[PDB]
């Protein structure tokens, strides 16, 4: 009864999970937070902030390693899946990790300095701790590599693209991919003849147009900062304004890069919270700035949903996913009501249902386009790749 | 037989025209270029680069003033219309110029330093030279002041909006307004119950959603740099990328503000020209980078057309206008073919017709949304305001 160990080794943490190969169900999950700080802890199932203070990425993973052995599931780990933030133009699909692949990840790493160098740290660690174990890299950008130049080029000097690799990459590729695969079953569509928009709304937020099973457009850019307005991230912003602000407040780009990433978005407008639940209640309690934050949030989701639909021959579906997309009844309704131009009719009792109801249509029958909610499962998608890649002869 | 003198007093030039009040036809047009330089000239009808070297804004206008008198149409100038680049939140419509209005323009001027201070220069000049003459200000942003906060707020700290006035203003308001007024006649729509998208493609390029006669969304931002990719302007650009570029090439914001405005856009991608005619032939001759420039250009127009349609209850029309929108048969077709998702069917023989055919439908009858070309006439719109305002008792 073998298992896959999935690992998202970020800058501050190491979010892991263990899935059963047979059923892809989660047998174990955890998180080694406070990494690089003296105050570092490991909490399995959120049950006991352990002692792991002032420890590095490889120690954290060894801590988790010993905890896997403690639950007699070390000699059952057939596959290790690694989440990588950024794949540049080198990675178009998931791959078995080898020395070539490390080099290649290390080459594209400058495109995402924070995250990738931590992902690499996780890979070196895992490979030390599990050397007989097949390991796999899954890239958050690779699903979007089917985009055409017209879709991914910026309007900058060509040199910036060809010399420096400055172009739209897009993120949430694993989610957009998984959700879309699931969409074909739930809507009874033909992958080869279909057009979906997937609104992944969570932590970060991005839209993705999926034509005939392929990503043809996505809202995030070279960095995860483009596109939708998010929790603390600004989303789309007139560079003229950012330039003007610099000259008016006497701030740097480093200053403004913080502001746009950390003090902006839902938080920036509301001046209250990045959390929708807080703001949704804030609006119900009559806070105007919370109302505006949500209305703006909703407005920009609509704008990009409709826009991404231009990259489709036919619009068969809109699929909400992620923490916000799976759980926010209001946001889903406001967004759908903002797309009446596309002929969307919502079913409110169906949209009322909580996330317990899982993969579910939320549109009435008169609706010209089907709306649905499909819980994302990035870990399951990572496993399914790892499983598939397990059959390979290297 | 009275006339209106229209004046667009930019940073480098003074583009003027003289319209007959009766028919709104242009009796005279000209341009005093090379302003502030020692090499300065005045060319009426493009017929004789006159001697006006090393002269200021008021001299240029006096030169034009004496040329109006030379053609016995000085004592016939009933109204002077002034084009203003930026109106902030103070100007929601055209207004009769008074001391209050100068102060108010001077207050919002910091929102558009280059252009507005030249517009003010033109106003002081005109008022000197024509003091008994009623004068009017028409603002390029005022049509977009019906936008809701959700439509015009950026996802930045609220403080940047309330303290510093950082929000989407949008431009081409006079064109989008005129074109839309004309749309209601050409399509036989009810202003009060309608939804148009207007693609003004020229010099600068912007989209505008017009719901029930009101601007509800527009692609340009606080500066004319947001939205569509343009001749030399980048359009939408991931701030993360602009930040990354800065750290990689060691450039300033001033450096990058030049690049994004002057070396970018159609020119930036093609590495050849900002002129579509050059690039269109370049593609026909087999230049790949010209092909990519146009395809990207077209792709982003489609994206924003569809997106702006989200701010409509119903999409009745898409209207092309401006130098590129009135004259480019290919761009219009490629854009429309990119919006097959909205059910657009094009009539190619109708789309083939040159701009001589004027206000004209370009879509087949099966088309679920009407497409048309409507030549913009900003000068006529300025006159019609000035005429209307001529009836007022101050």
UniProtKB/Swiss-Prot annotation, chains A, B:
Any GO BP annotation: acetate metabolic process
Keyword Thylakoid belongs to the record: no
Entry EC no(s): 2.7.2.15
Intrachain disulfide bonds: none
Any single GO CC term annotated in Swiss-Prot or TrEMBL for this entry: cytosol
Pfam families, A to Z: Acetate_kinase
InterPro entries from the UniProt entry: Ac/propionate_kinase, Aliphatic_acid_kin_short-chain, Aliphatic_acid_kinase_CS, ATPase_NBD, Propionate_kinase
Gene Ontology molecular function terms on file: acetate kinase activity; ATP binding; metal ion binding; propionate kinase activity
Binding site for Mg(2+): 8, 378
Transmembrane parts of this sequence: none
Catalysed reactions listed for this entry: propanoate + ATP = propanoyl phosphate + ADP
Marked site: Transition state stabilizer: 172, 233
Binding site for substrate: 83
Cofactor needs: Mg(2+)
Positions bound to ATP: 8, 15, 172, 200-204, 275-277, 323-327
Keyword match Kinase: yes
Catalytic EC class: transferase
Subunit description: Homodimer.
Function: Catalyzes the conversion of propionyl phosphate and ADP to propionate and ATP. It can also use acetyl phosphate as phosphate group acceptor.
Family designation: Belongs to the acetokinase family. TdcD subfamily.
Database matches in NCBIfam families: ackA, PRK12379.1
This protein's name: Propionate kinase
Organism: Salmonella typhimurium (strain LT2 / SGSC1412 / ATCC 700720)
Encoding gene per record: tdcD
């Amino acid at each position: 009864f073998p298992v896959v160990l999935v690992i998202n080794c970020g800058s501050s943490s190491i979010k892991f999970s263990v899935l059963d190969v047979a059923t892809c169900d989660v047998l174990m999950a955890g998180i080694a937070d406070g990494m690089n700080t003296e105050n570092a802890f490991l909490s399995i199932n959120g049950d006991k902030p352990i002692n792991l203070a002032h420890s590095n990425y490889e120690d954290a993973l060894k801590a988790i390693a010993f905890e896997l052995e403690k639950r007699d599931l070390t000699d059952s780990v057939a596959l290790i899946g690694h989440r990588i933030a950024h794949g540049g133009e080198l990675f178009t699909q998931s791959v078995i990790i080898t020395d070539e692949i490390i080099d290649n990840i290390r080459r594209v790493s400058p495109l995402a300095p924070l995250h990738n160098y931590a992902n690499l740290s996780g890979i070196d660690a895992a490979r030390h701790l599990f050397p007989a174990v097949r390991q796999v890299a899954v890239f958050d950008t690779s699903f979007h590599q089917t985009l055409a130049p017209e879709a991914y080029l910026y309007g900058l000097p060509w040199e910036y693209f060809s010399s420096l690799g400055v172009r739209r990459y897009g993120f949430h590729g694993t989610s957009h991919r998984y959700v879309s695969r699931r969409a074909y079953e739930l809507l009874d569509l033909d992958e080869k003849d279909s057009g979906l928009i997937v609104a992944h709304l969570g932590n970060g937020a991005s839209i993705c147009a999926v034509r005939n099973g392929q990503s043809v457009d996505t809202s995030m850019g070279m960095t995860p900062l483009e596109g939708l307005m998010m929790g603390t991230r600004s989303g789309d912003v007139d560079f003229g304004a950012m330039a003007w602000i610099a000259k008016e407040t006497g701030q740097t780009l480093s200053d403004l890069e913080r502001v746009v990433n950390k003090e902006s978005g839902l938080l920036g407008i509301s001046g209250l919270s990045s959390d929708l639940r807080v703001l949704e209640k804030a609006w119900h309690e009559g806070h105007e700035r919370a109302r505006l934050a949500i209305k703006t949030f909703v407005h920009r989701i609509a704008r990009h949903i409709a826009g991404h639909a231009a990259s489709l021959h036919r619009l068969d579906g809109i699929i909400f996913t992620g923490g916000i997309g799976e759980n926010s009844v209001l946001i889903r309704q406001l967004v759908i009501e903002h797309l009446g131009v596309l002929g969307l009719t919502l079913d409110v009792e169906m949209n009322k249902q909580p996330n317990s109801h899982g993969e579910r249509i939320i549109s009435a029958n008169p609706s010209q386009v089907i709306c649905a909610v499909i819980p994302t499962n990035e870990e399951k998608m990572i496993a399914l790749d790892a499983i598939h890649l397990g059959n390979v002869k290297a």
